[PDB]
Each structure stands twice: as structure tokens, then as C-alpha cells.
Scaffold this active site. Structure first.
Site, mmCIF file in Angstrom:
data_model
loop_
_atom_site.group_PDB
_atom_site.id
_atom_site.type_symbol
_atom_site.label_atom_id
_atom_site.label_comp_id
_atom_site.label_asym_id
_atom_site.label_seq_id
_atom_site.Cartn_x
_atom_site.Cartn_y
_atom_site.Cartn_z
ATOM 1 N N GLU B 357 -11.528 3.923 3.238
ATOM 2 C CA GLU B 357 -10.993 4.502 2.281
ATOM 3 C C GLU B 357 -11.218 6.174 2.017
ATOM 4 O OE1 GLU B 357 -8.271 2.607 1.648
ATOM 5 O OE2 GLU B 357 -9.684 0.912 1.148
ATOM 6 N N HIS B 487 6.401 -8.593 2.214
ATOM 7 C CA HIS B 487 6.918 -7.553 2.684
ATOM 8 C C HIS B 487 8.721 -7.558 2.607
ATOM 9 C CE1 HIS B 487 3.101 -6.015 3.582
ATOM 10 N NE2 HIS B 487 2.688 -7.296 3.866
#
Ligand SMILES: [Cl-]
Ligand SMILES: [Zn+2]
Lengths: 173, 597
Positions: B357, B487
Site C-alpha cells: 500500500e 470482474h
């Protein structure tokens, strides 16, 4: 005498900055010499004393502080406040996130970003007429019509680069 | 007052106003995801909605300017973006309907829960429940059940919608001068005018199908290996020359073979590249984790996190008396206001995650200079690859000892390594083909090359070719599996997951040879090297500013996505496998089936 500009309760918005004139008076400069409080002090003239003036105050973004100094193209110096290439004194600043910034945004401080021509040193412009890159008088929401003034809107939670900093430009003659 | 001069001044206005609405949009979106109440949620929309408004306005407003009249190329690029001609070119009727479709698919997939045919009074959702099954279940049937249950209930339901979904979406694409919704997506990779840095919306397909070739050997071989391994797990249910049964691949679709580690591990007699204990045994807290990662990036000549970052960020689960979404996330709220949301938990996974991150955050800052419209990764992949670059270095036992989470005395042996190395193939190299065949199928379906009544007979005709995998029950056009995956049934460019994979390696190579690396490529730890950092920061601070190809160059030193460096990471492995497969069959017959007849 300075206690009225610095320490002052409310500050003017760049484009419409305020010039103070201090005649026949004395101050030590030591109220300024010390107190790290300030985040900027670049003095384009000297740094001593001789109990001998101009003091313009206003408020700009963080990274916009860079522009209160000779040279420097601008967008702030091109259109809001321009310091003379030569002649000079000092530029001073301090962070005021808590005073000038809220958690909901405080868009009360403005700056001009559209103008025809650049501001010649010390100049000022309080105009507020719809802008167009050719001169054609504007009338929003017409195409290519913009109100030259915009708010900063300082949120207490933004980068130090985007926090409210007040400015006092002490000019000597 | 040319045509450019007018655009110049437009963007300028857009930038300063977008910065304020977008900031307002994020702060709300932030207060929600970290306080989930009623006042905060209601709010999230208002702000979000205003920002949604400003767009259509500014989009169907950037029309004033005919792109072909631009010299300062950047402007054209920016102007191009605002040219998100959205789904307006359609008819208010269609646009309405379209969104009505998307939404349903989304909520069906989210809500769809199947009930025990052998206990109608009990049911399960995809996550958890079903997914819980597809990852751990060793029952050939229980797995079989969940696999079919899912593609049978929700699958079918989504069939009608998807069918219409295509057409409409295709209509859009054509209008904007794109061969189909397919050539639309490919767009993200296109480059126009710059010399030797251009790229067509079609060369993706070439350079993908080209690169994918060199991967085949490695894949076939990984396949062949796990195959025999599975043959033991599920005795008699598999063919030594046949394909692999979809319901047996570690998860609901075979996306990633990760969860197969359990029963494919080369050497069970090995143990811990898991410092999770060491961390808790040293009383490390949230702060330490993130603070430590900050160091890593500094160690390569990048900046400390912002004073604000620590003041605003949420590093630990608030607990009760304040409910919050715990998906670890990078936040680039703009206004130089960065931060991370993670309900941190002193484990290794989390430790690497925290690095991953902080990698996004690092990328974000790098391109903060760029104009509001260029503040992003060169492409969809770039940003994820950058993050995974970090996960890669921090995972090395080298870096782990380097920091005192791994007893200095521990010495890595070439077997614990083969492990890790394959535990990687399982994820990185398993999803590669699965991804290539997927997008290719949508891709083809969008060039029409695949009829409505062969939509599965074409799915599995390539699932059995490209992925060397089979269906445990045959499906007819009643089912629509190519959409059974988030997706897809939620509209998304799925090719990212492929390209981001290569990119991350040429980046990892570029940075190891630059940071002078002597061991095998996966032993690299760019750490402490500034000189290789500098090499990163070049592609980084670009944002979308240049063509991804230039961006790619800056680091790697080339102009295209080459798979040779992935193959490099997986070379100590690649051979170890040719070795296990000396007696195994390497490949598969597209004809064999589990159900038979
Ligand atoms: Cl499928
Ligand atoms: Zn990520």
C-alpha cells in the site's frame, strides 16, 4: 505598531490584499527576530536594525508562498501580488490551519487566476468582471466565460502544501 | 484567442474546480468507509453525486474543442480524457436500460445465494460459504456441487442480461470510432504521435499473444506437475494426459491456483518464511509496521509519509462504537492529502501489505506535480505493479533478517526456496493463461466472432486449449459462466491482471541489475539502494503524462512488455519441473472429459 497587522484577528484575501503604512514610529524587530512560529523569513535586503515603511498582509495556499519573492513567474505573482525585481525588504509567513481552515472547508479566501496582462510590481486588482481570452464581455453561463475570482477552501485535513498561510510583506523605502 | 488558447483556459478552470469537488467527494467517501452511519452515508452520495454532476457537465462541454487543433500535445491528452463521452451518445431510453442491466447483474451476483438441495432450509452466499468450499473442500462432489450450484442459479439468470448487455455496449463503442466494446478497452494502451513510442489498439493483441507464447513452456510444465499432484488428491477423478476439472482448482473459477499449495507443495518438510510470530514476539504494533515501511522507501531516496498521513490515516480497526470497511486501501484524496485505510493486524501478510500500500502512496506523490488529469499510473496495470514491486523485495529472507524479524542465524536452503518459488507459480503463473483466455473470449465475443448459441461451446473450447481445463458437467447456452466472475458480470477490463504481471517483473529486473544484484532474480531486495530508486522515480513522477512505453523505458530500458524477465524470476523453478515431469506427460488432450459421454 505592528501588532495590528500580525496578531491581527482577520486577514485579507490575496487579490484584494491590504497595505498598511506605518509612519513616525519605532519597533525593535526583535518581536520578529525570535519566535520560530514563522515558516518563512527570506529577507531580500538585509537582516539587522537601525530604528528608522510598508506592510502588506494577505493569505495564500501553502506552495503559493514560494511566489512571494522577486522573479518567480506566478499565477499568484502574475495575477494577484507582484514583488519588484529589484527594490526589496522581507517576506514572512505562518501556518494557520486552525484559524483559517475548517473541517467542512472554508472557501472565504479568494485568488485571481484569469487576467489580461501581468501585474506590475506592487499593483493590485479588485476587478470582478466575467473573463474571456479576447476581450469579449462575458455573461455566464456563456461559452468561455469565467469569473476571475475563486475560493481556496482550506480543509483542516489537507497537505502542508495546501494549508492556509498568512503573509506579511514588509517593504522599506 | 486561437482554438488551443481557449482550451488552455478551459482546462485551467476545470482543474481548480475539479480539485475541490473531487476532494469533497473523497472526504465523504472517507468518512463513510471509516464510520458507516446514516448521516455519513447519506452525505457520501450528495458529495459523490455533485462530483458525478460536474463531470457530465464538463464532458459534454469539452466538445467546444475539436481535438485535432492541438500543438502542446499534453492539452490534447487532457482534453481527450474529459472526452469521456460517457453513455450519452446513446438514447436516454437505452442509457437508462443499460444502467438498469449493469445494476441487476451487480446485485444478482452480490445477492445470489444458493440453497442446499439436501437441506432447503439452509443456504450460502458466494463469500463466504461457497468460496469457503472452493478453497478448502476435498470432497469431489461438495466442490462439484458449489461449482455448478453457482453457475446454475446466478449463471443462467445473467445470460439474458449479458446478451443484451453486449449489443448496447457495442453500439456505444462504434459511435466513438471503435471497432467494438473490445477495441474500446484496448484503447487504454493506445499512443498517438511521439515517434517510436506509439502503439495501436490492436498491437496489444499481437504483443500479448506473442509474449504469451514464450510463457507456454513454463505453464504446460507447471500444469503437468500440479496435475499428477491432484491425481493423488482426487484419486481416479483425473486423466494423466487430460485437462484439469474446473471445480478442483483452489477457488470458484480457477482464477488463482493459490489454495492448491496445500496439496502440491514440493517438500512438506519445510517451514517459515513466516515472521508472523517474530512480530508478535517483539510486541510490534500497527505504527511499527507502517513506520518501518516508510523507512524502506526512504532507504531508496524517496520521502517520509506526510505529517498529515499519520494524523488522518486509520491504521487499526476502530472496533465497536464505530463500524468500518476493512479492505486495505491506498488513498490519494488530492490536495496533497494522502492516507491509508487498513484494520492492521500484526502478521506478515499485513506487514507486506502495508508495504504494498505505501507503494501506491509513493507513486501517488511522485506524480502530484502533473495536472489533475494526469495524476494516475501510466495505465491500469502500472499502479498495481508498482505496489507488488514492494511486496516482492520485503518478502526476501534477506530483507527480513536485515530488519530483525528473522533470526540472523537462519540460512536459506534451496528447497524452502523451490517451495516459495512454486507457491508463486500457483498464483502469478496460474492466473496468467486463465486471464488471457478470459479477455480473449470477451474480446472475440465483442468482434462478434462468437454466436449466441455457441457462447459456452466456445468458452470451454478455449478453456480446454489455452488453460487446459475442463467442465465437470457440460453446459448449454442456459448457463453464462464467462460472467459468473465478478470482474465480468460487473463490467471490467480484465487484461490489466495480465499486463500488470509482466510490467512488475521487468521493473523488478530493471531494479535489481541497477541495484547491482548477484543472486537469482527473486532474491533481490532493492532496499537501501538509492541509485535504483532514482531509476524508479522517473517512470513514477510521470503519471499518465507520457506514453506508458516511455514510462516503461525510464525504468526497464525498453519500449515493450517483455515476458523474458518473468521467465527469469521463474528459472530456478522452470527446470526443477522439467525434472519432475521426466516421467509425467507435459500437455493435455482437449478431448478428455470428467463427466464422459
Ligand atoms: Cl467458467
Ligand atoms: Zn493494490
Amino acid at each position: 505598531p505592528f501588532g495590528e497587522v500580525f496578531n491581527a484577528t482577520k486577514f485579507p484575501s490575496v487579490y484584494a490584499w491590504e497595505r498598511k503604512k506605518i509612519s513616525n514610529c519605532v519597533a525593535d524587530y526583535s518581536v520578529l527576530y525570535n519566535s520560530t512560529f514563522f515558516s518563512t523569513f527570506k529577507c531580500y535586503g538585509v537582516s539587522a536594525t537601525k530604528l528608522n515603511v510598508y506592510a502588506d498582509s494577505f493569505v495564500v495556499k501553502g506552495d503559493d508562498v514560494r511566489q512571494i519573492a522577486p522573479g518567480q513567474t506566478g499565477v499568484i505573482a502574475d495575477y494577484n501580488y507582484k514583488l519588484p525585481d529589484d527594490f526589496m525588504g522581507c517576506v514572512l509567513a505562518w501556518n494557520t490551519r486552525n484559524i483559517d481552515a475548517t473541517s467542512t472547508g472554508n472557501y472565504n479566501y479568494k485568488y485571481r487566476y484569469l487576467r489580461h496582462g501581468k501585474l506590475r510590481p506592487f499593483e493590485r486588482d479588485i476587478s470582478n468582471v466575467p473573463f474571456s481570452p479576447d476581450g469579449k464581455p462575458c455573461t455566464p453561463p456563456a461559452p468561455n466565460c469565467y469569473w476571475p475570482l475563486r475560493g481556496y477552501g482550506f480543509y483542516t485535513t489537507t497537505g502542508i502544501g495546501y494549508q492556509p498561510y498568512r503573509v506579511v510583506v514588509l517593504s522599506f523605502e | 484567442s486561437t482554438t488551443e488558447e481557449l482550451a488552455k483556459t478551459f482546462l485551467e478552470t476545470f482543474n481548480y474546480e475539479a480539485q475541490e469537488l473531487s476532494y469533497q467527494s473523497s472526504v465523504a467517501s472517507w468518512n463513510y468507509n471509516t464510520n458507516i452511519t446514516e448521516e455519513n452515508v447519506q452525505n457520501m452520495n450528495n458529495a459523490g453525486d455533485k462530483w458525478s454532476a460536474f463531470l457530465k457537465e464538463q464532458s459534454t462541454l469539452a466538445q467546444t474543442y475539436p481535438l485535432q487543433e492541438i500543438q502542446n500535445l499534453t492539452v490534447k491528452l487532457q482534453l481527450q480524457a474529459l472526452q469521456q463521452n460517457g453513455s450519452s451518445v446513446l438514447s436516454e431510453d437505452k442509457s437508462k436500460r443499460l444502467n438498469t442491466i449493469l445494476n441487476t447483474m451487480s446485485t444478482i451476483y452480490s445477492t445470489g445465494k444458493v440453497c442446499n438441495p439436501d437441506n432447503p432450509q439452509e443456504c450460502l452466499l458466494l463469500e463466504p460459504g461457497l468460496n469457503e468450499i472452493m478453497a478448502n473442500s476435498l470432497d469431489y462432489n461438495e466442490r462439484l456441487w458449489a461449482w455448478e450450484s453457482w453457475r446454475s442459479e446466478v449463471g443462467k439468470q445473467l445470460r439474458p442480461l449479458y446478451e443484451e448487455y453486449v449489443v448496447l455496449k457495442n453500439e456505444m463503442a462504434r459511435a466513438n470510432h471503435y471497432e467494438d466494446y473490445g477495441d474500446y478497452w484496448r484503447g487504454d494502451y493506445e499512443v498517438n504521435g511521439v515517434d517510436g513510442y506509439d502503439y495501436s489498439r490492436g498491437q496489444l493483441i499481437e504483443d500479448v499473444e506473442h509474449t504469451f507464447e514464450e510463457i507456454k513452456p513454463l505453464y504446460e510444465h507447471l500444469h503437468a506437475y500440479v496435475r499428477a499432484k491432484l491425481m493423488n488428491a482426487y484419486p481416479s477423478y483425473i486423466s494423466p494426459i487430460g485437462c484439469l476439472p474446473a471445480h478442483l482448482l483452489g477457488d470458484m473459477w480457477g482464477r488463482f491456483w493459490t489454495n492448491l499449495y496445500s496439496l502440491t507443495v514440493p517438500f512438506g518438510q519445510k517451514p517459515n518464511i513466516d515472521v508472523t510470530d517474530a512480530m508478535v514476539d517483539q510486541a510490534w504494533d500497527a505504527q511499527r509496521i507502517f513506520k518501518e515501511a516508510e523507512k524502506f522507501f526512504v532507504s531508496v531516496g524517496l520521502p517520509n509519509m506526510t505529517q498529515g498521513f499519520w494524523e488522518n490515516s486509520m491504521l487499526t480497526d476502530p472496533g465497536n462504537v464505530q463500524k468500518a470497511v476493512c479492505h486495505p486501501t491506498a488513498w490519494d484524496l488530492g490536495k496533497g492529502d494522502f492516507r491509508i485505510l487498513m484494520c492492521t493486524k500484526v502478521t506478515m501478510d499485513d506487514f507486506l501489505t502495508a508495504h504494498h500500500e505505501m507503494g501506491h502512496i509513493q507513486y501517488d506523490m511522485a506524480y502530484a506535480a502533473q495536472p489533475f488529469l494526469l495524476r494516475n499510473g501510466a495505465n491500469e496495470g502500472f499502479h498495481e505493479a508498482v505496489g507488488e514491486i514492494m511486496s516482492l523485495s520485503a518478502a526476501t529472507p534477506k530483507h527480513l533478517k536485515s530488519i530483525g524479524l528473522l533470526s540472523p542465524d537462519f540460512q536459506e536452503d534451496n528447497e524452502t526456496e523451490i517451495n516459495f518459488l512454486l507457491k508463486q507459480a500457483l498464483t502469478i503463473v496460474g492466473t496468467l493463461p486463465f486471464t488471457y483466455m478470459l479477455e480473449k473470449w470477451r474480446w472475440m465475443v465483442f468482434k462478434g466472432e462468437i454466436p449466441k448459441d455457441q457462447w459456452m461451446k466456445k468458452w470451454w473450447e478455449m478453456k480446454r486449449e489455452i488453460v487446459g481445463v475442463v467442465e465437470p458437467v457440460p453446459h448449454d447456452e442456459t448457463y453464462c459462466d464467462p460472467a459468473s466472475l465478478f470482474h465480468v458480470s460487473n463490467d471490467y477490463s480484465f487484461i490489466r491482471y495480465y499486463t500488470r504481471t509482466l510490467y512488475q517483473f521487468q521493473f523488478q529486473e530493471a531494479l535489481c541489475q541497477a541495484a547491482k544484484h548477484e543472486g537469482p532474480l527473486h532474491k533481490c531486495d532493492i532496499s537501501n539502494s538509492t541509485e535504483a530508486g532514482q531509476k524508479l522515480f522517473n517512470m513514477l513522477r510521470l503519471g499518465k503524462s507520457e506514453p506508458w512505453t516511455l514510462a516503461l523505458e525510464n525504468v526497464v530500458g525498453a519500449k515493450n512488455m517483455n515476458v523474458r524477465p518473468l521467465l527469469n524470476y521463474f528459472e530456478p523453478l522452470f527446470t526443477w519441473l522439467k525434472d519432475q515431469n521426466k516421467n509425467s506427460f507435459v500437455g493435455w488432450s482437449t478431448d478428455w472429459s470428467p463427466y464422459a459421454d
